[PDB]
C-alpha atoms as a printed R data frame, in Angstrom:
   type eleno elety resid chain resno       x      y       z
1  ATOM     1    CA   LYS     A     1 -56.786  8.731 -44.147
2  ATOM     2    CA   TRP     A     2 -53.463  7.294 -43.183
3  ATOM     3    CA   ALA     A     3 -54.808  6.166 -39.745
4  ATOM     4    CA   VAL     A     4 -54.058  2.567 -40.974
5  ATOM     5    CA   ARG     A     5 -50.392  3.501 -40.103
6  ATOM     6    CA   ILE     A     6 -51.579  3.798 -36.331
7  ATOM     7    CA   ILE     A     7 -52.264  0.132 -36.427
8  ATOM     8    CA   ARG     A     8 -48.948 -0.434 -37.979
9  ATOM     9    CA   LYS     A     9 -47.800  1.696 -35.094
10 ATOM    10    CA   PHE     A    10 -48.802 -1.205 -32.920
11 ATOM    11    CA   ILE     A    11 -46.860 -3.441 -35.097
12 ATOM    12    CA   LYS     A    12 -43.965 -1.284 -34.522
13 ATOM    13    CA   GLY     A    13 -44.574 -2.079 -31.021
14 ATOM    14    CA   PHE     A    14 -45.139 -5.756 -31.517
15 ATOM    15    CA   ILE     A    15 -42.141 -6.208 -33.978
16 ATOM    16    CA   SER     A    16 -40.074 -4.263 -31.498
């Protein structure tokens, strides 16, 4: 659970 946020973490590196 909530490991989807890890992919969003990559997004946090992509958007920034």
